[PDB]
């Protein structure tokens, strides 16, 4: 019997607003460690890794290890019936194929939603723990803007990371352009370049990743030659949300 109490329920809301458009149906692994979710996107071009540690919850409790095939769209819709201040409570039954969402308003009102679960034979993937040539930390808003800007120039973005700074660029019908960031608290840009790197990614997906911006003031980008770019947003004391995007290769 699972039961977790999250006071800053807006966190859960923000999480689903960050997965819903990228993932249709996902599986939520529950255990004494906390909630976790890993899933390729529809396009099978990226992988999302969600980590919600039990410590972050104001009351966690997991008797039996659970695997909840959840329809993130239904869960999203349901979660929009929660105020950004309500206390949210996930609660499941090892025997019931339904998850329960209870929202308690701060002040006389309690919403209770029973969401139907489903059997998902999701294709599991295993991330190869590796090292990265470059890691860029920067405001999530700046990153988000960058991706929106370039999206008007072209479909893909070339991320070139050198010693001094990092550069994003694109091109299309209406010419081309590029944005340059250089090293210089959550307004600053730090760069860790062991090896200059250059990789091409689809702005379409980067733009999906950015729906997570309201989860953190900052975001770190981890690249390396010929490997998936890592876009990660920390979820203060709860855990995090990681997006892996496969780069575009030349033929």
């Amino acid at each position: 019997m699972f039961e977790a109490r999250l006071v800053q329920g807006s966190i859960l809301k923000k999480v689903l607003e960050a997965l819903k458009d990228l993932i249709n149906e996902a599986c939520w692994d529950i255990s004494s460690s906390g909630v976790n979710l890993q899933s390729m996107d529809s396009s099978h071009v990226s992988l999302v890794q969600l980590t919600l540690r039990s410590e972050g919850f104001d009351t966690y409790r997991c008797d039996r290890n659970l695997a909840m095939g959840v329809n993130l769209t239904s869960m999203s819709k349901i979660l929009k019936c929660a105020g950004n201040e309500d206390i949210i409570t996930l609660r499941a039954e090892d025997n019931a194929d339904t998850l329960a969402l209870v929202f308690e308003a701060p002040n006389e009102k309690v919403s209770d939603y029973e969401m139907k679960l489903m059997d998902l034979d999701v294709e599991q993937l295993g991330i190869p723990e590796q090292e990265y040539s470059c890691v860029v930390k920067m405001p999530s808003g700046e990153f988000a803007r960058i991706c929106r800007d370039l999206s008007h120039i072209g479909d893909a973005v070339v991320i070139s990371c050198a010693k001094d700074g990092v550069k994003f660029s694109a091109s299309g019908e209406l010419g081309n352009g590029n944005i340059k960031l250089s090293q210089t608290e959550e307004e600053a840009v730090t760069i860790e370049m062991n090896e200059p790197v250059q990789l091409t990614f689809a702005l379409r997906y980067l733009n999906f990743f950015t729906k997570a911006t309201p989860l953190s003031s900052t975001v770190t980008l981890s690249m390396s030659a010929d490997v998936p770019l890592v876009v990660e947003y920390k979820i203060a004391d709860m855990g995090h949300l990681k997006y892996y995007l496969a780069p575009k290769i030349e033929d």
Binding site: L125, A246, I249
Partner: peptide
């Protein structure tokens, strides 16, 4: 820098 690759080619199951 031309063809989109799927994560499956980078990540094994």
């Amino acid at each position: 820098a031309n063809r989109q690759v799927s994560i499956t080619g980078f990540f094994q199951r």
